[PDB]
Amino acid sequence: KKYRWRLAETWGPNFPIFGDASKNMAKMVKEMSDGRLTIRIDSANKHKSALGIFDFVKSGQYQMGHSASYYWKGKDFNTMFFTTVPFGMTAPEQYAWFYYGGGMELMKETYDQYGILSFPGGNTGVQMGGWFRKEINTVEDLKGLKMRIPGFAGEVLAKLGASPTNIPSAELYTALERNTIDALEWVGPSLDLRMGFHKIAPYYYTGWQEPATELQFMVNQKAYDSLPADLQKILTVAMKTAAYDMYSQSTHENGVNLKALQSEYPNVKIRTFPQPVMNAIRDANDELLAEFAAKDKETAKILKSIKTYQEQVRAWTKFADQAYLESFESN
Amino acid sequence: KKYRWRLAETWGPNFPIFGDASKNMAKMVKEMSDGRLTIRIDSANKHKSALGIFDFVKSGQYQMGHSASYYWKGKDFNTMFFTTVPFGMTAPEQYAWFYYGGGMELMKETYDQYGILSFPGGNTGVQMGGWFRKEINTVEDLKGLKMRIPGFAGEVLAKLGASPTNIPSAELYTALERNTIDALEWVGPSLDLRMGFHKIAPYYYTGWQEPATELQFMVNQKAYDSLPADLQKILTVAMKTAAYDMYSQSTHENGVNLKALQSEYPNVKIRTFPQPVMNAIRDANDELLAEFAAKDKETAKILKSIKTYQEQVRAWTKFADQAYLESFE
Ligand code: NA
Ligand code: NA
């Protein structure tokens, strides 16, 4: 008659934006449910397994998790494509895909076999390319590069001879400080500056690899089923709402912090990969997508949905948003 | 105790996207509250007053409404700025403004004095510039032009010599047909084609004047306060959610319908106002913004907040999203 659930999240405690999304979700559920369902959150400082969230929720040890789908590529490579993909969709496009273009259904197709329900957990919007010790001037500079980079982008850089890793949010600055890694990408101005990377890595590259990173709420299938229908709805709605508000917050904080970056950080050197490097990355991505499609029918089905939907909705984005933003004045 | 409410909407019945947003909200409230709060929706065919929604809600004749804030230009000029503004913010920028940048609070400053609570009610995304009988090649061509065009955009057109109006959704075609107006804007590919404008006015201009139209839920203050706190939250969350989903839906359907537009409506001729005309519209909007700000301290404050927040958030949009889109193609 009264439910007490626990949520495990990848992030350190009191982590802004990402931790706000899980917090906001839990507060809404309590408030809408007059306390019938309440959700206590354990961050990485507590459960000490930032990348164990999938297992926590699969087993039922936590009813819920907040994390990112593409962290679970080991469990199932198809988990990569429900977060974001290189050269993929923007957040408005991707939210359309999830809720109106078949994405939610495809995600369930992957996650049902684990007894996990996955839901969008909040979008960062467009991400940066990351923080580097040394500039990337040629493809050869990626060879043996120790870079923290998750998801399919990680796969792509491995294909080009890099040495990618997935170090979780709270340990990133330390890994770079000790030279465990020599480059990293995290998110963008909204979180990267308070996390301190610029102190060690002067070069801040523009992105390509995460155009709209969607985080993930995960729910144990049995816990969800243990709920009455009205609370089930409160839960799913609160997650969707928290996810959307996080994109709003990320956009807000990116505005605040790009501004700080263009005035309070004279030693940050904003850079873009040279075109020959982008062409090489683009080709490796396209080739690797083909490989992944050819080797599994479900992978092939997801990538075809992503590609097809992007082609349709991007034409509108180009026609509308992009043209609006590119508009100028002569004279 | 059970709460049985009514919502009045501006739109006709089974109106795609806009009407989906109000139904989604009502359905969410019913399901989350296990029937404790249910909301019957009355469309314009039933209450017969498409632009009577403000007064319906103010009076409490209806507990709620779904409409757009800039229709109430005549009851308070400041209501225009909580829908969208010419050369203004995109939807992701504006949601950030509403929820994290002070927009909600500013909107409440305006609506509180009418016993109404106003909330974001769904964004269309970027709108087209409208449907025209004749191409617009010079500023001159706007002079005398009778056009249906709402909100602050109408005021920019009037300043350049056009004659704006605001007719309800339902009689635009007829008004176009009987040469009452010679041009109009409505929304975009998601909703425009089914209205039939293209049969009479084949030139379809790209936009500038409604970069991110946010619809509006209104709630009677007394009605809102009659609710216990958990149903109040269910209600506010439902509106917020329905609003965000409508932007996702609008994006989806804009994509679907743009793809089909060339094939299925070969007589539509896509156009963009000439650069000298845009320069003039731009100057005109800049001028009117100053003029409107000088008339009223609250207006100046609303406009200063939008200007300031947009400057900050657009810098990001250009640095990130636009650069990314231009990086392909
Ligand atoms: Na990232
Ligand atoms: Na419009």
Peptide bond into B329 cis (omega under 30): yes
CATH superfamily of A124-208+268-295: Periplasmic binding protein-like II (3.40.190.10)
- List the beta bridge partners of residue B40: B6
Handedness of CA B17, B23, B27, B33 (dihedral sign): positive
Q: Choose among B98, B101, B251: nearest Cβ to A96.
A: B251
Dist CA B260 CA B178 (whole Å): 29
Q: How many CB atoms lie within 10 A of CB A228?
A: 13
Burial class (CB in 10 A: 0-12, 13-18, 19+), A300: middle
Q: Choose among B207, B255, B312: nearest Cβ to A324.
A: B207
**Closest-CA residue in chain A for B123?**
A92
Assign B121 to helix, strand or coil.
strand
Inter-chain touch A318–B325, beta carbons under 8 Å: yes
**Closest-CA residue in chain A for B95?**
A248
Q: How many CB atoms lie within 10 A of CB A100?
A: 20
Dist CA A274 CA B121 (whole Å): 43
**Closest-CA residue in chain B for A246?**
B96
- Identical fold between B1-123+209-267+297-329 and B124-208+268-295: yes
- The domains of chain A are located at 1-123+209-267+297-331, 124-208+268-295
Dist CA A58 CA A43 (whole Å): 18
* B205 CA → ligand 2 middle, Å: 13
Handedness of CA A281, A283, A284, A288 (dihedral sign): positive
* B118 CA → ligand 2 middle, Å: 19
**Closest-CA residue in chain B for A31?**
B230
- List the beta bridge partners of residue A217: A66, A119
Torsion of CA A68, A72, A76, A81, to 10 degrees: 30
Inter-chain touch A313–B100, beta carbons under 8 Å: no
- Phi, psi angle pair for A40, to nearest 5°: -95, 135
DSSP A157: H
* B123 CA → ligand 2 middle, Å: 11
CB-CB contact of B317 with B188 (8 Å): no
Inter-chain touch A237–B241, beta carbons under 8 Å: yes
- Phi, psi angle pair for A118, to nearest 5°: -110, 140
DSSP A125: -
- List the beta bridge partners of residue B4: B38
CA within 13 Å, CB half, B258? 22
Distance of CA A44 to the CA centre of its chain: 17
Structure-solving method: X-ray
DSSP A109: H
Dist CA B22 CA B30 (whole Å): 12
Angle at B103 (CA atoms; ends B98, B106), nearest 5 degrees: 155
- List the beta bridge partners of residue A320: none
Dist CA B300 CA B280 (whole Å): 23
Q: Choose among A34, A252, A316: nearest Cβ to B96.
A: A252
- List B residues 150-179 in contact with A (Cβ-Cβ < 8 A): none
Assign A38 to helix, strand or coil.
strand
The CATH topology of domain B1-123+209-267+297-329 is: D-Maltodextrin-Binding Protein; domain 2 (3.40.190)
Burial class (CB in 10 A: 0-12, 13-18, 19+), A8: buried
Q: Where are the beta strands (DSSP E) in A192-286?
A: 203-205, 214-220, 269-271
Peptide bond into B140 cis (omega under 30): no
- Phi, psi angle pair for B164, to nearest 5°: -65, 165
Distances (CA, A) of B17 to B12, B190, B245, B254: 12, 9, 9, 11
What does R_g of chain B's alpha carbons equal in angstroms?
Answer: 20
A108: its two tokens? 């369930």
Assign B188 to helix, strand or coil.
coil
Distance of CA B36 to the CA centre of its chain: 31
- The residue type found at A281 is I
Architecture of domain A1-123+209-267+297-331: 3-Layer(aba) Sandwich (3.40)
